[PDB]
Design a protein around this ligand. Structure first.
Ligand SMILES: NC(=O)c1ccc[n+]([C@@H]2O[C@H](COP(=O)([O-])OP(=O)(O)OC[C@H]3O[C@@H](n4cnc5c(N)ncnc54)[C@H](O)[C@@H]3O)[C@@H](O)[C@H]2O)c1
Lengths: 496, 496, 497, 501
């Protein structure tokens, strides 16, 4: 509550904290108790346009795009140091807004620091290449330039984390940006803008728009002055964005959902498999893009595994994120909880079984909050919607498989391909499986490990492009081939 | 004419030369005299789908995708050797179909050979990277895999050249492909498929669909089994394709048009500037994506330059591509010539001047052909359509500029950004200019120089992605991060 | 006295001409199977070596090859690769005739050599440097890769053409001029490849072949001031000598020396696989391989069982003529080398080891005239002995036990060398842990002898300096230049006007 | 002023740093450190023995093998190198004064070093976790091929006296970023800033044995640092004759080497150059730090059409160069480092006169009253010389430049390359195309077009020919501290069955 007394309630456009053009506002909720904890501006589409034009003017002036890469690196680094300095407050603020446990939030702040630090160090390392020209008396070189103006749109599950992944490289490369976080979770994003302002950037280089996607999203994807749209969210929105971006042939980077398999062989460390299955399915109430919602367990240990899992699920401590006992918090909103509830109806209707959970808890201390019980769904198959679609809640499905080939076939029988895992003490087997899985990230005997050093993104419909690592940086760069003819001669093709 | 007696008239699907599903056909024209010279199959949308499903089956069997990169390289190299072996016939065939001069066609065959040779040698050079994991007791690696099934669509101006740019990397990486050339120029594309078949590839690895984009194009961009659409064509079609590809969040590579500036300073080698201005504007009747249709000349030499240019334009030899005297051939079709003619009306209507040309030649020997006189348009400015839009004909516009900053501003005052040139003996100045031009390729004291060793593509609306060079190869690859935990421990987050 | 030799040159190739030794001296080349003279070649002088080097310099400076486009240089290296394949059969027979190894082992080399030239042919036009984001405003910073210049290349006798391919390919791909000198006792295939390269066509002086003893012309090739790089593959004592001499003109060096390569076998290894590969590692080409698995480390729980299985197999190894399909192991290269091996048997016995099998010349009738030596297995030895620490380079292996994984690693690394080694175990996780702790340039897991152009090869510790093959291999033949242009120069005005 | 300089020394260690402890020489022997401005002893430090060097090397080995640093995550190693960078900036002022006190160069030149050093550590800190090897597309089916980059192991690092901390930063940063253990030995006559940086690195915190500092004469402990068998790499920056000796000794255990030796760096000036700019940079190139710079532009090549005009402009400017104390703001050029070095320079003036050259200005000690007690030597210009002379071919390493004429572009290139060296050089001309042609033909590691002395961590530095072996700075700089390992796994092993059963 203390955190909020000095926190800005406004958008940041062209170097000034400013209200919505129509002074409209929005109430921010704390999912633990559904109480309004803060009120922020609700920007208009004209505000978004003004920010974009500001980013363009700034980009063209060259104050940031022509700054030395080394210096750009030092500034991104300064932002990283600010995350660490205000680690505590930021973590609490994220837990307050999103509802996840405090330790999960501390972990984010550690990642975020490393994300900024990674890109800060990557800034001055590769400015292009020299080519051995196949034409005599010519010099051929490729120079990497910042792509230009970029719009950045994030989801509500991990607001600052997803923002760090976009901001760091944009700044490291010299781009100008316009960021818009999920309308329902802008607290940490506002805070980071306050921090970036302290670090100091040229007027127009960074901008923050606050508002509903349905209202200002189309401007951010479709305005002609935008050179790249980096979006992290739902698949249906991603498609809409791509279609809109096509109007001005605008580059896109999409980080969409997943139906991530968690493959468990009978030769896996059993207690390890159970631990990580619980983790994969219930961290942040399964509101994770890399969530292991699709468990694939080998028939020989399926029954044994289902029992062990269900027992553990019955003991999961639900509660307030600020409370150390809490193992799983609430889901983000009434709308989202309802979406999850309607999936339980869908699953039952198509023949699946709700082995445990699948309802709101009625325990007294949880009644006022947006809680939903950790759930396990059994007796399902690949043809069902509950198995194919991203529920994005504390829910997992269990499917059996006889052989290694069948496990692969099933893991890939999905429109998505973001991430997955394989558990087995036979490392050679796990390796074979990993090579055949059409997934952007594959974990062997682990789950949820991502880091700035390596690219993250999807195969198939989980996305287009990548974030993090060297490839992450590349989305914010464009190549130019400059060829100089050191001994120019007339071609004399046309008559004299 | 001899060339055509043994040339296939059919599509190539799943290892067999086959007719259209409805046995429909199309007549191919020779723009020099407008006579039908060949008849080919006109595929249906069901044929396109069948080819795509075939490419998928092939990709999944692994006969090509799992072949060693080294071997894949040897096969792409074998294709390169076939281009050189049949260099003569291919060149004649391209001149027959597209109408350009024979020497311009020989040049293509030399480039095409080098394109295949370049990618053949690039195939086994980079299979990913090893990462220094920030987490102890873990192994982190990134593997590059072929993206999967790719659809390739080409234009009519340089049919085989544009195809070579797509086929070479697709094959080098292990992808399966479905190619569809411009419905009006399929001759050389059919031939190269005959040649690739001789080299030998697994059933389904390569497929050729023949037909109108309006008929089968949507299947090639929108079918769910497609992992990448590589398109080279007009901007309006590119947007349509991107929008359609969005339905299954399909990657895209777009190589669209340009309004390429040819900047000439008063300190340029005058006779060199004139030579290259003629070249830039009239090679292949200005039907080149890199055509220098927008001449920007410095005011101090504008009048002198306009005279020199106009005199040379009056002497340009028009005629049959097979005739050595010929300097400029006809335009590709009655439809295209009409689009060009309507632009002359547009230009006159908006205040510009047709300083020379702007009409069909009435000379006896050219009357039956699709010729159009080389044209020079003066007294125009950046606000006019004739200057902003891609005419794609033997037409150039001349604009003056006082200073270096004004030249840059004008060169960039366009929705496009594919390529351009700068002429000046002050190499330092030319370099400054090159750095400020938002163009994918910038030539200093030269024009039209492109090659496999360097990436080609556009800034802004001239495209998305790149072709040729290492970046060209990357459009056909996808990254996977495989992280192994060599000493897995339970996290024990949840209760026991 | 076969067909291959009737049209083969007997001379050096200097500055575009096949020429005799300056003093017309010559040398007789032997076939180790029967010790008969099969060919006579020129024996160059140190003045001939100097003349070739000066020729390489003149050629390098004229730019006809160093300024050719990388793409074209690639096409020419590719043309050489095609020639290796075209004359695959003859080259393989010629190598078997000169070195004594089996024909199939020679066919395998010709396949690698082709792929070596092909790899570098494709690598030639792929990386010409980098563009740097300058920390100084109004400046352009770029790094350009240039051919290092004149390079001398010296090879051993075990795999003459293979070792030559590894040096020639990158030198030519990069634009360097070279002077090659093969082992004085095995120049046949090297001469042939020069004939083939000449057919491909290169500028006068770009390639040169010197024939002669290292003791005579080697010092010129490592110590002449016009040499920019010495690439040497041979024995450790010669490598040291070369490095010391190269220091006179601060000349770069690339050294590919010997090894005491461990073949680690755990009790959870595929037993029959381990035995197969142990035999292979120790006896291919009579153990005359730089990557030979002469130091077998077997886990105590299966040591006795493994020693028996190995010894039985060794007793059945078919020795004979390389051209004969039955032959599994040929002779050693020379009387001198066989004597070196025999003296090691005395050393081993003297320091307490046991010759469990072999350790002598075979007296079988059909082998008496040849330079044969029986495949040998030495037991009851430990790391403190010379027979275990030093490179014997013959058909000899030592067997040592180890109790734990840490002890296997400690022993595998208890050596002055670090070229290559292997680990056998069905527990891939364990094999991976071990591989990470082995100070070796190449580590094989459940395999042996796998090398290829796509990956760098070379040693840790005293097995060498630098690398061959892969991108790093190419880099030995390149030098970096940083060109920094100030696009808006201002006076600094540090000193008084 | 200079006072803040002497204060610096009251808290500075006087000892070697071996295996986590500040310790004296094994024989308690010591050495006096001089301030070249007045030749007064300003500090006394330990003078290590060869046994001390060996003990440090064995300590580095033990540490390397324990894996506390070599197995730390690259990311963390980066953070620590970054912490060192932050310490350079924090103590920027004191370090700069200390370097000026010890080496004699101006305070501003020292501030510049501290700025570079900070950036050097920062660069490598950010490079630490960026490339851990590559995955190869194996030509053999059912196999996985990967190349892992590992720290090379134990490294010995030896630096010169002209830019002590700068040359040390170039070696320490990558060694630490990569996970190597190191043993550093600075020039026996300039150990002040090197000792200080070790105090700072100790504060940052590193495992026992990871870093070690040996103090002593090269003639005494140098052979152990290059020839001990446990050393995996010797990184040396110094004179050519010492480099050759080191290489020869390193050969005993086939030990890798990185050598950064001298230069005879050409400063080429065409008649179409910005004349006043050419003169400014010619002065800079020849006299910064009294020409005691490895990249010094001691060989001026000026085009015949403007040679006479240039010689006069240069000489006039040389007569006005302000000599004095490094701590005094007026000072433009300080003294040379030692009586031995000044004598070496003086003997070169005799050499030049004897072989026919002309001492157009300077070539003597200044007799001005305030400079008499210091190791000063007048900025000198030598004319009427040619490529065959020793004064032109050899590295004088003093405030001396030679002027040679050239008629054509080809002649300029020929002369610039007529030298055993190839470290760096410059080209001045407004015709950028011409300057580019020239730059491509110069056998030099770094070539400046219309500038001089520009080096930075982002780009590799080193020589062609006898100016060295290997590179420092940039990605290539890091690679000297790494070794490649190819791990090939056969995922479906089969018996070869070559031998009978
Ligand atoms: N950027 C470059 O590298 C480059 C190179 C050459 C040409 N071009 C551009 O190409 C254009 C000229 O070629 P064009 O007139 O054939 O272009 P176009 O868009 O008119 O047609 C190109 C291709 O698209 C296909 N097509 C049409 N509708 C389609 C649909 N709905 N879905 C899928 N495919 C469809 C056609 O069959 C044809 O093969 C010009 O704009 C020119 O500047 C660009």
């Amino acid at each position: 509550m203390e955190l909020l007394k000095h926190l800005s309630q406004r958008q940041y456009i062209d170097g000034e904290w400013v209200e919505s053009a129509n002074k409209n506002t929005r109430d921010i909720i704390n999912p633990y108790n559904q109480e309004v904890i803060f009120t922020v501006s609700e920007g208009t589409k004209e505000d978004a346009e003004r920010a974009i034009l500001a980013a363009r003017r700034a980009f063209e002036s060259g104050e940031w795009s022509q700054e030395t890469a080394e210096t750009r690196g030092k500034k991104v680094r300064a932002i990283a140091d600010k995350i660490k300095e205000h680690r505590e407050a930021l973590a609490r603020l994220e837990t307050l807004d999103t509802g996840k446990t405090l330790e999960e939030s501390y972990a984010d702040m550690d990642d975020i620091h490393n994300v900024f630090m990674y890109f800060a160090g990557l800034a001055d390392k590769d400015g292009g290449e020299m080519i051995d020209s196949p034409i005599p008396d010519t010099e051929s070189k490729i120079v990497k330039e910042p792509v230009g103006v970029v719009t950045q749109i994030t989801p509500w599950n991990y607001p600052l984390l997803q923002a760090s992944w976009k901001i760091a490289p944009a700044l490291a490369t010299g781009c100008s940006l316009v960021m818009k976080p999920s309308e329902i979770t802008p607290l940490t994003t506002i805070r980071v803008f306050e921090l970036m302002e302290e670090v100091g950037f040229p007027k127009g280089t960074i901008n923050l728009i606050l508002g509903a996607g349905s209202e200002v999203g189309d401007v951010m994807s479709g305005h002609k002055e935008v050179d790249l749209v980096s979006f992290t969210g739902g698949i249906e929105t991603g498609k809409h964005i791509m279609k809109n971006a096509a109007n001005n042939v605008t580059n896109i980077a999409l980080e969409l959902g997943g139906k991530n398999p968690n493959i468990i062989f009978d030769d896996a460390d059993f207690e390890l498999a159970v631990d990580q299955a619980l983790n994969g399915g219930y961290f942040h109430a399964g509101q994770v893009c890399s969530a292991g919602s699709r468990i694939l367990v080998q028939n020989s240990i399926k029954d044994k595994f289902e029992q062990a899992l269900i027992d553990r699920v019955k003991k999961i401590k639900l509660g307030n994120g600020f409370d150390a006992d809490t193992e799983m918090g609430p889901v983000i909103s009434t709308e989202h909880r309802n979406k999850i509830e309607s999936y339980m109806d869908v699953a039952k209707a198509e023949g699946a079984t709700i082995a445990v959970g699948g309802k709101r808890p009625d325990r007294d201390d949880l009644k006022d909050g947006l809680f939903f019980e950790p759930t396990v769904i059994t007796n399902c198959d690949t043809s069902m919607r509950i198995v194919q679609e991203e529920v994005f809640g504390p829910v997992v499905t269990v499917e059996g498989f006889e052989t290694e080939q069948e496990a692969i076939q099933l893991a890939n029988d999905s429109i998505y391909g973001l991430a997955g895992a394989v558990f087995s003490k036979d490392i050679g087997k796990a390796q074979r499986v990993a090579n055949k899985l059409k997934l952007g990230t594959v974990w062997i005997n682990d789950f949820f490990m991502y880091f700035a050093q390596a690219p993250w993104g999807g195969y198939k419909q989980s996305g287009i492009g990548r974030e993090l690592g060297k490839e992450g940086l590349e989305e914010y760069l464009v190549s130019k081939h400059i060829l100089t003819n050191t001994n120019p001669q007339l071609v004399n093709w046309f008559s004299k």
